[PDB]
Each structure stands twice: as structure tokens, then as C-alpha cells.
């Protein structure tokens, strides 16, 4: 019962717990759950087409989900299906997982999925994508979506270490630490220095002199983490999501000063917040927090990191951030859950906003 990979999109949560079980909850009506129907799921609900799959992550998009076996060579996708998100070749809903035939076979090393689209790293360092394209975010030259996945190939000779995906755009870094960006840039969030979209990947120059080792998108904004543990913002700040004690927006990633005593090994970004998680446990939210998602014991939103308390100060060792809710697991095997939950997406059986952690029952030593 040791819960080894936690992902969250708009409204749902998945989980990889150990022994080979998927588990899915939150809102069900787009089969983004993958039990086989549109009910929605108030409790962690175990998806038994995965049951022996031999699953070794999960990830979620807004309404979809993927997981990845590396012994099957298979990755499996369920849930809405417009735009090509689900890279089967078509546009249908699936309310169960299947397989992405153009993956059979791959040596997956990561999978990242944003509104629309997702991307695929294999253990070589190339990348495909899928899905949306309209700003660019598929990385390939042109607004036209593909249902299937397709190779970046502005990336040939480069290998890529890491992706991430946000509403509409993509960032990832290589294993030589370069930063790159594109697709919807509006807002700043690609780390270009302007707000014109990109088609393929380009390079982010201006990184605080660092090789950086991780990405991670929210809707309009990108974080970034440096080899030397530091982190960077960029795009919108409306809401605080960048955590620097104000609401600028920047162009170009921008150094979290108030974090730069601590590493930071984990990043995850929701719609309009931030979680952080250092290399000791301790986690820092920030951003909007008007359901509770910033797990602070307050409404409020916040411009500057601030630690999200658990009981005995029990250390977070995994964190993902949903649209509006977090997730995180402890050292203490425990599984907690903040945010909004009128969907179910909390996992905590009654829908209701918890505006600090709470712990899930259904997959925690304590209780």
C-alpha cells in the first residue's frame, strides 16, 4: 500500500500505488477516471482494466490521463478526447484505458500533459507530442494538431532531460541543462523576454547564469529549478503564482530569492498557484487561494512562498498541483489532499473545499 506516483488535472486525481494498482478519483463525466462509465468518484477508486499492467507512472492532463508501463512497453491513455489528446488517432472520448499503438515499443522515460496535448521524452532523450497545437505547443512547426504523436525534431542531436506541459504552452530542459520554451507566450511564461508564441522549441538564454535541471507549467505561468537548487518564475503574476512578495509579470525566468537558502528538488504548478518542495521536506506554496489550494489554512491568496504545514511536521516527499487542488505524500506513507473538492477531486468522500492539508483515509497509514 505504498502510494508511489500522485497526478492531478482540472477537476481529478490519479495515484500509482505499489503492487500494480492504478487508483482515480474526482470528476468522472468525461471518462477521465478510466473505470469504464461517467460516474463521478468521491474516494480513490481502484482502475482494475490497469490491475497487472505493471503501470509505472501516471500523469494527468486537464481531463485526460496517461500511464506508462516500461516491462509491457505500452502506454495507455483514457478520458476527453478532442483535439487529438489522447494520440489514438482520432478525436473519441474513452472511458477505459487503451493503449497509444505509435508508442508501443518506446523506451519511455517521462510523460507530461497539459490542456490539450501531451509529450513524450524516451530514454534516449528525443521527444514526441500530440495533441492541441494551435499556439505551437506541439513544438513542431505549425498550428495544425496532431492525433498522433510526432517527433520534435529541432531537437535531433539535443537530448532532452525533462518536459513540462501547461494550458498551452511547453518548456523542458536538455541533460546539459539548457532551457527552452514554446507555444502560447502571451503572458511571458515561455522565458523569451516577449509575448509572441512559438512553433518550435527555443532556447531560454537568459537563466540567471545557470544550467537548469527541471520545468513545470501552470496556465500562464513556468517554473524553473537550477542544479544548484534555485528557482525561477515567469509569465503572470496576477495572482502571486510567481512568489516574489509581488504581482509582476516577468518575460525571462526570475530568481526566487525568499527560497535561495533552500534547495528545491520538486516543482509543481497549478492554474494560478506554485508548490515547491526542498530537498528536506519542507513544501512551499503560493499563488491564487481562493478554494483553499495553497494548503495555508486561509482563503487568501499569497505573493510570497509560505510552508504548508502537516501533522507533526511529518515531511512531504511528493507534491502535484491539479487546477485548483494539491496533492502531496509524506514520508509517513500518508496521502494528503487541499483545494477545491466540489468534484471529488480531494478524495476525502464529502466534496467540500479544504483550505489545508486533509488527510485521504483510503490510502494513509494514519487516519
Known amino acids: 500500500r ?6 492531478a488535472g482540472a477537476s481529478h486525481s490519479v495515484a500509482l500505488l505499489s503492487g500494480d494498482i492504478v487508483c482515480s478519483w474526482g470528476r468522472g463525466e468525461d471518462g477521465q477516471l478510466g473505470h469504464g462509465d461517467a460516474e463521478d468518484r468521491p474516494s480513490p477508486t481502484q482502475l482494475s482494466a490497469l490491475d497487472g499492467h505493471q503501470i509505472v507512472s501516471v500523469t494527468c492532463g486537464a481531463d485526460h490521463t496517461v500511464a506508462y508501463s516500461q516491462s509491457g512497453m505500452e502506454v495507455y491513455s483514457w478520458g476527453w478526447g478532442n483535439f487529438g489528446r489522447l494520440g489514438h ?17 518506446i523506451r519511455i522515460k517521462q510523460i507530461a500533459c497539459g490542456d490539450s ?10 521527444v514526441q507530442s500530440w495533441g492541441r497545437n494551435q499556439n505551437g505547443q506541439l513544438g513542431l512547426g505549425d498550428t495544425e494538431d496532431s492525433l498522433v504523436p510526432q517527433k520534435i525534431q529541432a531537437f535531433e542531436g539535443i537530448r532532452i532531460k525533462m518536459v513540462a506541459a501547461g494550458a498551452e504552452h511547453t518548456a523542458a530542459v536538455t541533460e546539459d541543462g539548457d532551457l527552452y520554451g514554446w507555444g502560447w507566450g502571451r503572458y511571458g511564461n515561455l522565458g523569451l523576454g516577449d509575448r509572441t508564441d512559438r512553433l518550435v522549441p527555443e532556447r531560454v538564454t537568459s537563466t540567471g547564469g545557470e544550467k537548469m535541471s527541471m520545468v513545470a507549467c501552470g496556465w500562464r505561468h513556468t517554473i524553473s529549478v537550477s542544479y544548484s537548487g534555485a528557482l525561477y518564475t515567469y509569465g503572470w503574476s496576477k495572482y502571486g503564482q510567481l512568489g516574489h512578495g509581488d504581482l509582476e509579470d516577468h518575460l525571462i ?3 526566487l530569492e525568499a527560497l535561495s537558502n533552500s534547495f528545491i528538488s520538486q516543482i509543481s504548478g497549478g492554474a494560478r498557484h506554485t508548490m515547491a518542495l526542498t530537498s528536506d521536506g519542507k513544501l512551499y ?7 483553499g489550494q495553497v494548503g495555508v489554512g486561509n482563503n487568501l491568496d499569497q505573493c510570497s512562498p509560505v ?4 501533522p507533526d511536521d511529518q515531511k512531504v516527499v511528493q507534491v502535484s498541483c491539479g487546477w485548483r487542488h494539491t496533492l502531496a505524500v509524506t514520508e509517513r506513507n500518508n496521502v494528503f489532499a487541499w483545494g477545491r473538492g466540489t468534484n471529488g477531486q480531494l478524495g476525502i468522500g464529502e466534496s467540500v473545499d479544504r483550505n489545508f492539508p486533509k488527510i485521504i483515509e483510503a490510502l494513509s497509514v494514519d487516519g
Not at 505504498?2 to 497526478?7: D, E, M, P, T
Not at 506554496?285 to 478554494?291: A, D, H, L, S
Not at 510552508?307 to 502537516?310: E, G, H, P, S, Y
Request: proline share 6%.
Open 2 to 7: 505504498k502510494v508511489l506516483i500522485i497526478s
Open 89 to 105: 488517432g482520432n478525436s473519441s472520448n474513452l472511458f477505459t484505458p487503451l493503449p497509444i499503438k505509435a508508442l508501443h515499443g
Open 117 to 126: 496535448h501531451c509529450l513524450a521524452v524516451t530514454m534516449e532523450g528525443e
Open 253 to 255: 525566468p526570475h530568481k
Open 285 to 291: 506554496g503560493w499563488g491564487w487561494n481562493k478554494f
Open 307 to 310: 510552508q504548508v504545514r502537516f
